[PDB]
Amino acid sequence: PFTNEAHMWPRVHDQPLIWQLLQSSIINKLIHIQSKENYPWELYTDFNEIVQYLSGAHGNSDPVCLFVCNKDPDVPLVLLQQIPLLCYMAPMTVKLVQLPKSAMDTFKSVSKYGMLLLRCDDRVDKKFVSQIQKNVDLLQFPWLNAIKYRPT
């Protein structure tokens, strides 16, 4: 497949109760001041630096965790075109995660656009990324399989 299984990324329903708690953490981040948001935690919220950090500028930390609001209308199809191939080709282990409910567009309302990648090495970040690697992991390359482009 090329984008066929790119529809079905996440498969767990234990997600929401801890997800809006993750948005509570997002509030904790964003309520300090322009600098003290990224003071303890590396958060990036600009598509330019989003792609520049994955281009190969710095390779310090392997685990990167990127989060996008998608699988819903009222969203840039043109920009959701190319982000999974970008996070896969990146040499860093980038765990792309897609918000599971469309009503969580408060994310769109708060940071910039509904895009946010972080450098997951802080002890709470990996404290839960070790519980999310248990949860979901699905990322392949279309050049390898290319057996289910879109038949039938």
Binding site: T3, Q82, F141, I147
Partner: protein, 104 residues
């Protein structure tokens, strides 16, 4: 030709064409990229089956015909740059020097 064996042959031919449209030269050689793109489209036109718009939008290039790809098999990247909006979102490639922009 039996219809049941003809359908299977059709899917097999489509699979083989899309697979050959991938690995080394369709990525590197823009000539072969355009050639195999034209061949695949002339093959899907003869069957008269609609193509999925979700991929049809961002499928390939319009100047040479390479897969729009940014950076188990390490390969070449299709798109060298992908800026922010800066006024409006655009995407550029290496194989040629033209860029395609879409509006939000």
């Amino acid at each position: 030709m039996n219809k049941d064996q003809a359908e299977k042959y059709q899917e097999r031919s489509l699979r083989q064409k899309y697979n050959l449209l991938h690995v080394l030269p369709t990525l590197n050689s823009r000539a072969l990229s355009g050639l195999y793109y034209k061949n695949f489209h002339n093959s899907v036109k003869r069957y008269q089956i609609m193509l999925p718009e979700q991929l049809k939008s961002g499928k390939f290039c319009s100047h040479c015909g390479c897969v729009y790809v940014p950076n188990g098999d390490s390969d070449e990247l299709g798109g060298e740059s992908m800026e922010g909006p800066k006024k409006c979102i655009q995407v550029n490639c290496l194989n040629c020097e033209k860029s395609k922009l879409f509006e939000w």
